Amino acid sequence: ATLKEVEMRLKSIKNIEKITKTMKIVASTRLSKAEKAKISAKKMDEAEQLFYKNAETKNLDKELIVAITSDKGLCGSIHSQLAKAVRRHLNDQPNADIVTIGDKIKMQLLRTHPNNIKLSINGIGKDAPTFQESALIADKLLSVMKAGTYPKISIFYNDPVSSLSFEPSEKPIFNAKTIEQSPSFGKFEIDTDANVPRDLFEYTLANQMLTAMAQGYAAEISARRNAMDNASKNAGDMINRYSILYNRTRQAVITNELVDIITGASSLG
Amino acid sequence: REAYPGDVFYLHSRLLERAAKLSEKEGSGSLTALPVIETQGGDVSAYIPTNVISITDGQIFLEAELFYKGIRP
């Protein structure tokens, strides 16, 4: 506990306080950006889930689970919360396939279940995602993963209930075979000669994964903003401790060298 | 300094230079020294180790932090 060690650590933690403050501001700016994408996902998803409310498409009786998390880290209690929701839902169906979108939930689930994971999307969270990326992943699910055979499909996303609250959430995807089995299906005049469930299923997959991405993105950035806020506050507090240690070290050092200057000046001839 | 005497570096000098390998014409005898220093709280800035480290031909610095993670020694 020198003066030099304490001064160096005080300088490094003043840099950490300043850098976490800047990161909080930049994350707040991207959050004000991505609220637009969250609203544009939700106001559009209502215009297709309202149909599924009125056409009651309740499924009955080998499952696909898809999670939407980040490629980066440093957002706090998201990367293990949604993994734990995967764990609760996954002990029920241990033979179900998993396609993770995001690096961190991949390094979660590959550590605990390297047999389930069959596809992993990487390269997502650099921006608010658009329809092109989610639609392209929606094509990749029905080109190599063969989700049309799957009876039941669920998407796990991260739901920002408010700014300081969050939620892992399940969102089911009804397959096209289920839609004709819907008790409320024949109210809607649909064609037999146009394959409208066989395309509406893919469009449902597209917009539901788009809502999942443009909602988990805003959830990530809100929780990351809260984490950098706690980092800036704890950095301020521990600077208010180390400044007191710095001052006590400086005073003890000046006194504990003035003692051994004076001590020579009394033991003279 | 630190109320140590003025020549404690000279004290460690004429101890840790009496141990050296002789040449052949003296018979290739040898005395090899391992002084051991207790320090204060993981520190090398103190006046006794800063005298001795400048004298001795190296160091085997033995942090307790590495001891508690199983690295024995």
From Swiss-Prot, chain A:
GO terms for cellular component: mitochondrial inner membrane; mitochondrion; proton-transporting ATP synthase complex. It is found in: Mitochondrion; Mitochondrion inner membrane. Pfam families: ATP-synt. Its main location: mitochondrion. PROSITE patterns: ATPASE_GAMMA. Present with 28100 molecules/cell in log phase SD medium. PubMed:12898710 reports two tandemly repeated copies of ATP3 (ATP3a and ATP3b) on the right arm of chromosome II in several laboratory strains, including S288c. This has not been confirmed by the yeast genome sequencing project. Belongs to the ATPase gamma chain family. NCBIfam families: ATPsyn_F1gamma. This is ATP synthase subunit gamma, mitochondrial. It comes from Saccharomyces cerevisiae (strain ATCC 204508 / S288c) (Baker's yeast).
Curated annotation (Swiss-Prot), chain B:
The chain holds residues 328 to 400 of 545 of the full protein. It comes from Saccharomyces cerevisiae (strain ATCC 204508 / S288c). F-type ATPases have 2 components, CF(1) - the catalytic core - and CF(0) - the membrane proton channel. CF(1) has five subunits: alpha(3), beta(3), gamma(1), delta(1), epsilon(1). CF(0) has three main subunits: a, b and c. It is found in: Mitochondrion inner membrane. Mitochondrial membrane ATP synthase (F(1)F(0) ATP synthase or Complex V) produces ATP from ADP in the presence of a proton gradient across the membrane which is generated by electron transport complexes of the respiratory chain. F-type ATPases consist of two structural domains, F(1) - containing the extramembraneous catalytic core, and F(0) - containing the membrane proton channel, linked together by a central stalk and a peripheral stalk. During catalysis, ATP synthesis in the catalytic domain of F(1) is coupled via a rotary mechanism of the central stalk subunits to proton translocation. Present with 41500 molecules/cell in log phase SD medium. This is ATP synthase subunit alpha, mitochondrial. Belongs to the ATPase alpha/beta chains family.
